[PDB]
Design an enzyme around this catalytic site. Structure first.
Site, mmCIF file in Angstrom:
data_model
loop_
_atom_site.group_PDB
_atom_site.id
_atom_site.type_symbol
_atom_site.label_atom_id
_atom_site.label_comp_id
_atom_site.label_asym_id
_atom_site.label_seq_id
_atom_site.Cartn_x
_atom_site.Cartn_y
_atom_site.Cartn_z
ATOM 1 N N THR E 1 0.873 -1.180 0.000
ATOM 2 C CA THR E 1 0.000 0.000 0.000
ATOM 3 C C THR E 1 0.894 1.209 0.000
ATOM 4 O OG1 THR E 1 -1.883 -1.204 1.042
ATOM 5 C CG2 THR E 1 -1.933 1.124 1.254
ATOM 6 N N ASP E 17 9.205 8.535 2.206
ATOM 7 C CA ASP E 17 7.976 7.984 1.779
ATOM 8 C C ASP E 17 7.723 8.059 0.354
ATOM 9 O OD1 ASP E 17 7.449 10.689 2.837
ATOM 10 O OD2 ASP E 17 5.509 10.398 1.810
ATOM 11 N N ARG E 19 4.754 8.807 -2.575
ATOM 12 C CA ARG E 19 3.595 9.621 -2.565
ATOM 13 C C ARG E 19 2.231 8.973 -2.254
ATOM 14 N NH1 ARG E 19 -1.356 10.689 -2.913
ATOM 15 N NH2 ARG E 19 -0.604 11.341 -0.757
ATOM 16 N N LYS E 33 0.523 14.406 -0.053
ATOM 17 C CA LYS E 33 1.755 14.126 0.735
ATOM 18 C C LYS E 33 1.291 13.004 1.623
ATOM 19 C CE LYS E 33 2.240 17.977 3.067
ATOM 20 N NZ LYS E 33 2.978 19.011 3.750
ATOM 21 N N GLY E 47 1.310 4.685 7.543
ATOM 22 C CA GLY E 47 1.433 3.477 6.706
ATOM 23 C C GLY E 47 0.289 2.516 7.052
ATOM 24 N N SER E 129 4.440 0.267 7.524
ATOM 25 C CA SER E 129 3.397 0.090 6.560
ATOM 26 C C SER E 129 3.451 -1.391 6.328
ATOM 27 C CB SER E 129 3.397 0.792 5.188
ATOM 28 O OG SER E 129 3.750 2.177 5.213
ATOM 29 N N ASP E 166 10.300 -2.671 -6.000
ATOM 30 C CA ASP E 166 9.851 -4.020 -5.767
ATOM 31 C C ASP E 166 8.340 -4.170 -5.679
ATOM 32 O OD1 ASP E 166 11.084 -6.648 -5.226
ATOM 33 O OD2 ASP E 166 9.630 -6.558 -3.576
ATOM 34 N N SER E 169 2.875 -0.625 -5.810
ATOM 35 C CA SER E 169 1.722 0.086 -5.257
ATOM 36 C C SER E 169 2.002 1.545 -5.048
ATOM 37 C CB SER E 169 1.382 -0.449 -3.816
ATOM 38 O OG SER E 169 0.782 -1.739 -3.902
#
Lengths: 233, 234, 201, 213, 219, 196, 249, 205, 246
Positions: E1, E17, E19, E33, E47, E129, E166, E169
């Site tokens: 996610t 992070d 976006r 953001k 996350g 996350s 990798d 998402s």
């Protein structure tokens, strides 16, 4: 200043001594227990013919076989009677039979004195009620007349009078009314005593009588019945 | 730990038709520290006297000039304790608003909220009103703003206002010294002068606090910066 | 549409018909009992099934109406008894349910019959019944029932209905309690056994 | 009836026969909470006056809670109503408990067997959901019809004349009680130890322990 | 996610992070953001599920504000941990938020990772996350467990870039949030790994495919 | 939920609404003489439809509410205003522990357009309209009005639309329903219309 | 202790008035002119703006003209303090009614909800009554255009033209003299209101800093609530001022 | 404004951005799930009457929530002159929904608005539990929000004319009713401008 | 609440102070007369103090509690309308009327409302820091029977039915003139009952049709409050009848 809550050096509360006087202000009511039944008599004392005499009431039903005459401030009593109606039928849901004169009277009397003028809950009295009630009926036990006071002292009576004539009438009842006097004679005794406090003579639009007799429910006397006792006083 | 509270009539109307308590509360704010607020229309500047009359007070974090939130501040005059609960309360409303909207509370909106509090204190008994007059500042939604809320629970709109001792003279000196369509720099200069016209005499940088308000936020300047300003003014 | 307290209207009276029964319909817990109870002399009702539940709601209905009727000196109607029961029972719901009472009184707009059940159904019809086995019964009865039947004429109607009903029905240890209600009075015609009436008729 | 889950079981079977002023109440002499019977001693029966004898059985947790309560309701009733406990006590208590046990299903059948304080004998039967009725036969437990029948056949004398051609006397009811208990052991396998029959009169409490036959 | 990390380095704290903010594995929005700036002193990375994380940061931010102003101490990460643990318990352990609180006290810079558990969790260096272990696992690998600030800032940015590569998402710009306790440098484009293809060619149409019979302004 | 049978055909000569008397519990009918259109006020109606019990329940509360506005305002309440207030009251009850979906059918007198019917969905949605059906039946009757529409339609033509439906309802519908109350409403009183 | 301090101002007097309402009644009179006149296409309010300085921000629409709803507006006579709490509460009530009914709220419906609260203070509690008397102007579907007045215990009266505040007797008599029950239009109605304010007020030429006038006008079936700006007000002042000039001659 | 579920009461909004304006199309139907029998009743509200928020799906939660929010909006609007921005309303909506438990109000919001009276455009769409996203590109929203966004990003030149846009967005609606089944027939376009509301009626199947 | 300070405390005179202070405030003014007919009951108040510039349509001093129960009120001072004080009794009574009709299927009777007024006055007495309303209400209405009734209450909370009564500015004086006017024909003819209310109001002070407002109720049908234009026509016809008898 001094409060009203205080006890006096006499040894009684001020608010309560005033409340007894409030009983004395109103109209006279007589409740006689006879062993043939219990009659309650009250004076209408109407001053105008434009009034409809049926709707001047001062006999209201606690129960369907107990009648109550009330004296002093007519309004102040009415609240106590409203709470009484809810208890009698409530008693029918729980016990599965109808309330007695004794049970109802002790329960209303607890409320009679509770007074704390400041720093007491608004769901509780600031001042006591100035009403004396006379609960008169015949119930499972038999004819009973109980008297309730604004001081919350309940006692069993056979003949009790309350209102302006309260001391005078009560003495006078003890004399004529005994348990060697029948129910119809009780109605005649009440009528004579009634007249001094009344402004006029006795009439069938100036008394309201209701008798609860064994084996029968509460009956409000009709114009014919009121008139038969008027003929011979 | 047994009480119901008392609510009694000294908070009801007198025969004169004016409220007995409000007049006395206005007297408490008149006795206070003088406080000027000027809307520049290039930012809002608020100035007060730092002093409490002994300068054995640490005040490098304790101030008379406190931010409520990112760009709205209160400066007060009048009573110190009553102000302390109002500062704390005002913040709490600001953050409540902050949760829902994402923008910090407008000066127009905030005063009504505060006003209810001032009102409870007057109208119910067994309490008494707050004796603090508030200068509320902000810059938000493209215009800088200055509001007044007096102790009764009234809010009044002014573009230059003076308070405390010689509140009357401050309003007249502001009328005279400050004119419309001048800049922020000019505004800052005029406030310290209104405080000179409103309790006079000796000033150090520990006798004054000056705070400037923009959308960048409200900040109360450090002791040094305030010192440079002093030398400018007569 | 179902048994256990059932009423059908006429001008002269209403018929009140009920069962004496104990427990569920699988066995009795007694034999002697009359479950018929007189809450007010306005009419009679009594059920069965979930026993605490029928008695509870009727007892509230009985309390409210009786106080209002007795104190005010104004007679309560079919409509009033029904409104009290309805309002109470939906609130109390979730604390077992199974009330099956039949409300009668004579009103200003003439005789009114409302059927009160524990779902919250409030119905007027030719004949209605709330409880269980009368559901079958309303079919034959409607044929043999006029809009206005006299009291005497109605008593003969009950006797025939029943006498065939016992033959069809296989519930024992019952009595048919027959009451005719002439308005704000209630009198008991006869309390005849279901086993007796098959022989008579 | 119902198979113990809601409240603990404690078995036991109650038979009740009313005559005219003598009423026998019998239940087994055991305290159970677990499949085994703790002790023969019990306090299932409690007397409040000689006028009224109550029996609560089954689940032991239910039995103690309601029986004490009944003693409280008696006290309250003598004071306020001014009628001594008896029939009147009985009708009142069955409503409040039966509301209490029936959403979370009832596992006690309390049986008030008494005389009214005005007189006339009542034997009162709850299902477990509020009803009160006067009876001359009663069967109560899961087996709420196993005794009922004997009292229906022998007491009522409906298609029967060989227990009595009329209706049972006091001498006759007590003779029948011993017999009935011996019989119960044969059919119902949820008992151990002893069966206790209490005979309630307005003038004599009787108790008798009788061994399980 | 979402792919969020914040770090304790030899300088202050660097948050990294991607976006994209997604309602599940599908993008609700491709702009704004993910790492959010709150008051001046507090920065929080977000996350896991979006719905649970944004709102938790926001509610705690009011509480923390009250505590900062009154106390007049700078915010402590242990302090921040306790507030999230108590709030999330109040709610009754509904939704999934792995939250990264990071603030500078007067001592060192302190960073904590609070998962949705309502734990009192002390990391060493953490990433959140996705799967908590899976993100955390990277920190042990690239960091020698302390190196100079500049080297560490390239290092986090590089490790976070690998998770973006990798796991598709995360999309759009990678933001780095350098957080002190009054300085919040929000660098939109630390690395842009991917971006779209231009939407130059229309799919517009004249009215002859759908028409209009009104153009009016009500009063 | 929708598996009643209502139709209301709005015109400004009349508004014809009909409903079945057929509140059935068990296998037989508890109501089969009670009318299914309730009187909120003497020129206003609410028709509550859903479950049998829930119908009687919705009306009594509502009846008190309509009359109360009449008292408060000291004129007949605004139709628009009532219909919206009946929508807020049905949504408020929806929150409460017993979930109640109720199809309400608003008949009102409005300042325009004339006799008016305001339409209520089981999405608890207030909608101004002309041509409506309530119940599972809404779906077919709205469609028949759509072939032949008139919203100033005289009474004779109203009988023709009705009759094509009644024969269909008798054989194709699961409501053969020979027991119906049919009423046509002018702006002053309720008149009873022929039933097939 | 506590009763003694309580001045027993909550007590009834034999005559049948409440001491507090009567003392509040005086608070309204000290304070400025608020008058409302009915007209036949709209309705207008004229209130005294008491905020004159040359340094004014104008952070509010006005400090006496309050738009309570998106279909009601009001003006103030009394104390600004009471006016601020009250004005907010008037907004929640107007707005909730708008949600349920979805039609403009009667002026009568709006005074009554508050009245309970006013009465509550006076009779018991020992709480001051609000120091403002409000003139609400509106249009509601049922009656058409209306004006309602509330007093310090919530005593209500429907008025075509009424005035409370400073020189209340003078303003209402004068307005009674020229106009009696709805004889004028919206245009003429602004010119009378400013004229009355002119005589009552110490400045006898006025400006737009001295008066603030608000209109509530029913356009295209929907109620428009607008506070008129200073520019519109000067036009209205010149029209009355000129009318006064002819009078003399 | 806000509602419960996503297509369980129809309603679908798509926006294309113009330099000057924003165009928004939505069907004008109504009724639960598949059936969309009636066609007169709104979903989009105005929060300045030049800013709108629309929540889309069940009508009950649409009118109850929309009205209850309006009371608070209004009080803020009257109080502070500068009526609340775009930004303020998105955040207000996020906080108001999360707050409930019973009958969970999960809207998929489309905010269609230039800010205040000023001529600076905004379009945004939010998720079911509607955390706020700042954006100034293009927005499609509904149960299948991501499908409308993709296509809304692909259609414009860059910023077609406002005129050109009403026609595009109307066609965007017409294809989408076919892709779902929870809505269909009747289409309304509100071109939302900085000083005016142009309401246009698009051609329906 | 925190307020429990005394406003009412009992007297040795056997009264409640507030109630008596209220009773004199209905002696001194605000004439309200009611007569009971044989199809219709009419109640009338004189004064809304229409000074020829005030509104007459929306002002209510007679308020409908129900559609078969209505009350006209009075108690006056220098603060002349105690509409506010009434407005509380009116709102609580309005819900209670409606409430009684939901529970009990008989239409609510005047006798229920009159007991409800007797308990509201009293309840305010017993509660700490609280005071009885000054109102006296002429409760008009219809029962289950459909029989017209007129009942009158006092500020204590005691009620009586009366065929015709007048209160305000000499309760007994207006009633004794009105006593001649109450005849068998007057009660039978509905039109004559409307005139009887107006005819009493005229005794205290004569003329005005705008000052006089009266509301009429027929059967269980809703309250109709009459136009002032209807009153003016009626006072003119009443004045000529006085010359005819006399």
């Amino acid at each position: 200043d001094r409060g009203v809550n205080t006890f006096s050096p006499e040894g009684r509360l001020f608010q309560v001594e005033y409340a007894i006087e409030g009983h004395k202000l109103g109209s006279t009511a007589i409740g006689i227990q006879t062993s043939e039944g219990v009659c309650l008599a009250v004076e209408k004392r109407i001053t105008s013919p434009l009034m409809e005499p049926s709707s001047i009431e001062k006999i209201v039903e606690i129960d369907a076989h107990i009648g109550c005459a009330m004296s002093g401030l007519i309004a102040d009593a009415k609240t106590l009677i409203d709470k009484a109606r809810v208890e009698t039928q409530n008693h029918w849901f729980t016990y599965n039979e109808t309330m007695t004169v004794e049970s109802v009277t002790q329960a209303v009397s607890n409320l009679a004195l509770q007074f704390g003028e400041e720093d007491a809950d608004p769901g509780a009295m600031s001042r006591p009620f100035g009403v004396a009630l006379l609960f008169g009926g015949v119930d499972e036990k038999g004819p009973q007349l109980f008297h309730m006071d604004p001081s919350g002292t309940f006692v069993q009576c056979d003949a009790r009078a309350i209102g302006s004539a309260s001391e005078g009438a009560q003495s006078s009842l003890q004399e004529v009314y005994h348990k060697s006097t029948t129910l119809k004679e009780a109605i005649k005794s009440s009528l004579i005593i009634l007249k001094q406090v009344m402004e006029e003579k006795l009439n069938a639009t100036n008394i309201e009588l209701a008798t609860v007799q064994p084996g029968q429910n509460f009956h409000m006397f009709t114009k014919e019945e009121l008139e038969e006792v008027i003929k011979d006083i | 730990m047994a009480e119901r509270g008392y609510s009694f009539s000294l908070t009801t109307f007198s025969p004169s038709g004016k409220l007995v308590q409000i007049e006395y509360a206005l007297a408490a704010v008149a006795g206070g520290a003088p406080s000027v607020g000027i809307k520049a229309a290039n930012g809002v500047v608020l100035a007060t006297e730092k002093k409490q009359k002994s300068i054995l007070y640490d005040e490098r974090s304790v101030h008379k000039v406190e931010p409520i939130t990112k760009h709205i501040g209160l400066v007060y005059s009048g009573m110190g304790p009553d102000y302390r609960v109002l500062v704390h309360r005002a913040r709490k409303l600001a953050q409540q608003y902050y949760l829902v909207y994402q923008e910090p509370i407008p000066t127009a909106q905030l005063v009504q909220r505060v006003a209810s509090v001032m009102q409870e204190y007057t109208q119910s008994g067994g309490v008494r009103p707050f004796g603090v007059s508030l200068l509320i500042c902000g810059w938000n939604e493209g215009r800088p703003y200055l509001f007044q809320s007096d102790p009764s629970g009234a809010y009044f709109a002014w573009k230059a206002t003076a308070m405390g001792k010689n509140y009357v003279n401050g309003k007249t000196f502001l009328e005279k010294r400050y004119n419309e369509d001048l800049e922020l720099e000019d505004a800052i200069h005029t406030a310290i002068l209104t405080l000179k016209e409103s309790f006079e005499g000796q000033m150090t940088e520990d006798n004054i606090e000056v705070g400037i308000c923009n959308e960048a936020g409200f900040r109360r300047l450090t002791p040094t910066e305030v010192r440079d300003y002093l030398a400018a003014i007569a | 549409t179902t048994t256990l307290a059932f009423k059908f209207q006429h001008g002269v009276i209403v018929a009140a018909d009920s069962r004496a029964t104990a427990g569920p319909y699988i066995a009795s817990q007694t034999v002697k009992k009359v479950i018929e109870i007189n809450p007010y002399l306005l009419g009679t009702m009594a059920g069965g099934a979930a026993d605490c539940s029928f008695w509870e709601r009727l007892l509230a209905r009985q309390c409210r109406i009786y106080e209002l009727r007795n104190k005010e000196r104004i007679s309560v109607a079919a409509a009033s008894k029904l409104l009290a029961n309805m309002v109470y029972q939906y609130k109390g719901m979730g604390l077992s349910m199974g009330t099956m009472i039949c409300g009668w009184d004579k009103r200003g707009p003439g005789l009114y019959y409302v059927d009160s059940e524990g779902n919250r159904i409030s119905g007027t019809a030719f004949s209605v019944g709330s409880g269980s086995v009368y559901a079958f019964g309303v079919m034959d009865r409607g044929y043999s029932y006029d809009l206005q039947v006299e009291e005497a004429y109605d008593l003969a109607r009950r006797a025939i209905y029943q006498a065939t009903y016992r033959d069809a029905y296989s519930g024992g240890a019952v009595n048919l309690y027959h009451v005719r209600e002439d308005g704000w009075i209630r009198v008991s015609s006869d309390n005849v056994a279901d086993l007796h009436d098959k022989y008579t008729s | 009836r119902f198979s113990p889950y809601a409240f603990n079981g404690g078995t036991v079977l109650a038979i009740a026969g009313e005559d005219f002023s003598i009423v026998a109440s019998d239940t087994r002499l055991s305290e159970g909470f677990s499949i085994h019977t703790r002790d023969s001693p019990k306090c299932y029966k409690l007397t409040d006056k000689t006028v009224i004898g109550c029996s609560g059985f089954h689940g032991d947790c239910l039995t103690l809670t309601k029986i004490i309560e009944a003693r409280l309701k008696m006290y309250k009733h003598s004071n306020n109503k001014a009628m001594t406990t008896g029939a009147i006590a009985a009708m009142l208590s069955t409503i409040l408990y039966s509301r209490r046990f029936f959403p979370y299903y009832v596992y006690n059948i309390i049986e008030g067997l008494d005389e009214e304080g005005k007189g006339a004998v009542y034997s009162f039967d709850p299902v477990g959901s509020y009803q009160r009725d006067s009876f001359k036969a009663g069967g109560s437990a899961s087996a709420m019809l196993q005794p009922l029948l004997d009292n229906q056949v022998g007491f009522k004398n409906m298609q029967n004349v060989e227990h009595v051609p009329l209706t049972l006397d006091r001498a006759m009811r007590l003779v029948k009680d011993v017999f009935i208990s011996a019989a119960e052991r044969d059919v119902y396998t949820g008992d151990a130890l002893r069966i206790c029959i209490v005979t309630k009169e307005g003038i004599r409490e009787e108790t008798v322990p009788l061994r399980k036959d | 996610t979402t792919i969020a990390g914040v770090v304790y380095k030899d300088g202050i704290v660097l948050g990294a992070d991607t976006r994209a903010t997604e309602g599940m594995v599908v993008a609700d929005k491709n702009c704004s953001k993910i790492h959010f700036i709150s008051p001046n002193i507090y920065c929080c990375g977000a996350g896991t599920a979006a719905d649970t994380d944004m709102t938790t940061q926001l509610i705690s931010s009011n509480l923390e504000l009250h505590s900062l102003t009154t106390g007049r101490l700078p915010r402590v990460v242990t302090a921040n941990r306790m507030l999230k643990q108590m709030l999330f318990r109040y709610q009754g352990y509904i939704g999934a938020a792995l939250v990264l609180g990071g603030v500078d006290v007067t001592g060192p810079h302190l960073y904590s990772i609070y998962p949705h558990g309502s734990t009192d969790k002390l990391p060493y260096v953490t990433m959140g996350s996705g799967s908590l272990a899976a993100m955390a696992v990277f920190e042990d690998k690239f960091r020698p467990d302390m190196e100079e600030e500049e080297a560490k800032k390239l290092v986090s940015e590089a490790i976070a870039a690998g998770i973006f590569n990798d796991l598709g998402s995360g999309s759009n710009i990678d933001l780095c949030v350098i957080s002190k306790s009054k300085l919040d440098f929000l660098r939109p484009y630390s690395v842009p790994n991917k971006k779209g293809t231009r939407f130059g060619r229309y799919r517009c149409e004249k009215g002859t495919t759908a028409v209009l019979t009104e153009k009016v302004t009500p009063l | 939920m929708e598996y009643l049978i209502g139709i209301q055909g709005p015109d400004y000569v009349l508004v014809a609404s009909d409903r079945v008397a057929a509140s059935n519990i068990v296998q037989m009918k508890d109501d089969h003489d009670k009318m299914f259109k309730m009187s909120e006020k003497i020129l206003l109606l609410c028709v509550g439809e859903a479950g049998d019990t829930v119908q009687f329940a919705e009306y009594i509360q509502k009846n008190v509410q309509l009359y109360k506005m009449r008292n408060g305002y000291e004129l007949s309440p605004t139709a628009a205003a009532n219909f919206t207030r009946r929508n807020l009251a049905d949504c408020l009850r929806s929150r409460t522990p017993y979930h109640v979906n109720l199809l309400l059918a608003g008949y009102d007198e409005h300042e325009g357009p004339a006799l008016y019917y305001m339409d209520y969905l089981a999405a608890l949605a207030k909608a101004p309209f002309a041509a409506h059906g309530y119940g599972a039946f809404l779906t077919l009757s709205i469609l028949d009005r759509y072939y032949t529409p008139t919203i100033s339609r005289e009474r004779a033509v109203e009988l023709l639309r009705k009759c094509l439906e009644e024969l269909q309802k008798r054989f194709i519908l699961n409501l053969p329903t020979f027991s119906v109350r049919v009423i046509d409403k002018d702006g002053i009183h309720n008149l009873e219309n022929i039933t097939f | 202790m506590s009763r003694r301090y309580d001045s027993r101002t909550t007590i009834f007097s034999p005559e049948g008035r409440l001491y507090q309402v009567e003392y509040a009644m005086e608070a309204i009179g000290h304070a400025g002119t608020c008058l409302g006149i009915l007209a036949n296409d709209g309705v207008l309010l004229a209130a005294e703006r008491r905020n004159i300085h040359k340094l004014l921000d104008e952070v509010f629409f006005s400090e006496k003209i309050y738009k309570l709803n998106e279909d009601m507006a009001c003006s103030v006579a009394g104390i600004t303090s009471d006016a601020n709490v009250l004005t907010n509460e008037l907004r929640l009530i107007a707005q909730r009614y708008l949600l349920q009914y979805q039609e403009p709220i009667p002026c009568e419906q709006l005074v009554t909800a508050l009245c309970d609260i006013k009465q509550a203070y006076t009779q018991f509690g020992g709480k001051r009554p609000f120091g403002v008397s409000l003139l609400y102007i509106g249009w509601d579907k049922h009656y058409g255009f209306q004006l309602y007045q509330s007093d310090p215990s919530g005593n209500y009266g429907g008025w075509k033209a009424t005035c409370i505040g400073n020189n209340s007797a003078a303003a209402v008599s004068m307005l009674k003299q020229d106009y009696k029950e709805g004889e004028m239009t919206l245009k003429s109605a602004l010119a009378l209101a400013v004229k009355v304010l002119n005589k009552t007020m110490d400045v006898s030429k006025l400006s737009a800093e001295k008066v603030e006038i608000a209109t509530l006008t029913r356009e295209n079936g929907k109620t428009v609530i607008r506070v008129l700006k200073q520019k519109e007000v000067e036009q209205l002042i010149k029209k009355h001022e000129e009318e006064e000039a002819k009078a003399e001659r | 404004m806000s509602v419960m579920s996503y297509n369980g009461g129809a309603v679908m909004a798509m926006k294309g951005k113009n330099c000057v304006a924003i165009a928004a199309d939505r069907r004008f139907g109504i009724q639960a799930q598949m059936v969309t029998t009636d066609f007169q009743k709104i979903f989009p509200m105005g929060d300045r009457l030049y800013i709108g928020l629309a929540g889309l799906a069940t009508d009950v939660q649409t009118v109850a929530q929309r009205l209850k929010f309006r009371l608070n909006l209004y009080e803020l609007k009257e109080g502070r002159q500068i009526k609340p921005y775009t930004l303020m309303s998105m955040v207000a909506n996020l906080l108001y929904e999360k707050r409930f438990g019973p009958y969970y109000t999960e809207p998929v919001i489309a905010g269609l608005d230039p800010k205040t009276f000023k001529p600076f455009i905004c379009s945004l769409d939010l998720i079911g539990c509607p955390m706020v996203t700042d954006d100034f590109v293009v927005s499609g929203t509904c149960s299948e929000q991501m499908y409308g966004m993709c296509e809304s990003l692909w259609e414009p030149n860059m910023d077609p004319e406002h005129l050109f846009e009403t026609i595009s967005q109307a066609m965007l609606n017409a294809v989408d009713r076919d892709a779902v089944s929870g809505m269909g027939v009747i289409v309304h376009i509100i071109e939302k401008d900085k000083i005016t509301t142009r309401t246009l009626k698009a051609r329906m199947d | 609440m925190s307020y429990d300070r005394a406003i009412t405390v009992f007297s040795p005179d056997g009264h409640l102070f507030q109630v008596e202070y209220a009773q004199e405030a209905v002696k001194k003014g605000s004439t309200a007369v009611g007569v009971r007919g044989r199809d219709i009951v009419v109640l009338g108040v004189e004064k809304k103090s229409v000074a020829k510039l005030q509104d007459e349509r929306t002002v209510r001093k007679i308020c409908a509690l129900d559609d078969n129960v209505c009350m006209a009120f009075a108690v006056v001072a220098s603060v002349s309308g105690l509409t506010a004080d009434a407005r509380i009794v009116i709102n609580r009574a309005r819900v209670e009327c409606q409430s009684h009709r939901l529970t009990v299927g008989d239409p609510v009777t005047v006798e229920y409302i009159t007991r409800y007024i007797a308990s509201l006055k009293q309840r305010y007495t017993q509660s700490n820091g609280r005071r009885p309303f000054g109102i006296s209400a002429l409760i008009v209405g219809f029962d289950f029977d459909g029989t017209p009734r007129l009942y009158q209450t006092d500020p204590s909370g005691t009620y009586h039915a009366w065929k015709a009564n007048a209160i305000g500015r000499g309760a007994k004086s207006v009633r004794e003139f009105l006593e001649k006017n109450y005849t068998d024909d007057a009660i039978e003819t509905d039109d004559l009952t409307i005139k009887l209310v107006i005819k009493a109001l005229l005794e205290v002070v004569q003329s005005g049709g705008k000052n006089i407002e009266l509301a009429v109720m027929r059967r269980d049908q809703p309250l109709k409050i009459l136009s002032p234009e209807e009153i003016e026509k009626y006072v003119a016809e009443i004045e000529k009848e006085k010359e005819e008898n006399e």
